[PDB]
Amino acid sequence: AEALSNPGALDLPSLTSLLSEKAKEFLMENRVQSFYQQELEMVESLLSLANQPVIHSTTSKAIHSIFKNAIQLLQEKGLVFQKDDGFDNLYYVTREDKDLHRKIHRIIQQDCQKPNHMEKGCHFLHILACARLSIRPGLSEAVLQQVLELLEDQSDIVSTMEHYYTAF
């Protein structure tokens, strides 16, 4: 509550961290599926937080920079992702991509296409290798981890060993 009440006291990295947290809260509360960066810049509560003297010391570039860095923190955490689409400012929210969840679930249900003499289920890295071939070549470890956590929360998959998953 303190930082949010006086964000002008923060150094730029701390401010960027805080903006990223408030951006996450916005995206989750509104069940946003995809967004252009500029849409977050238009949320008054986010722009008011971001717009501190430290960002200014062009103006549009200063605002673009802090918002881009905040969104990238969410990307690094696997909460948002991009497609190879030529749209630098378009982002997708991992938790809202139902097709992605279903496809990862299917990969796991099918034991990552392993012959039936091998172990049921598959390792994180195997799932990732399959998903990059069949779904999205750029899929990060962090985005996959977020999908797996959601599937686990839904009791659709179970971890039987460290980083190893089978259908529930």
Author numbering: 190 to 246, 258 to 368
What does the paper say about this structure?
To elucidate the function of the human telomeric Stn1-Ten1 complex in telomere biology, we prepared the full-length hStn1-Ten1, the truncated hStn1N-Ten1 and hStn1C proteins to homogeneity. In both RPA and Stn1, the OB fold is a ssDNA-binding domain while the C-terminal domain is important for protein-protein interactions.
Like the scCST, the hCST (Ctc1, hStn1 and hTen1) complex is predicted to contain multiple OB-folds and it binds telomeric overhangs with high affinity and some specificity. Overall, hCST plays a role in telomere replication, and may also have a more general role under conditions of replicative stress.
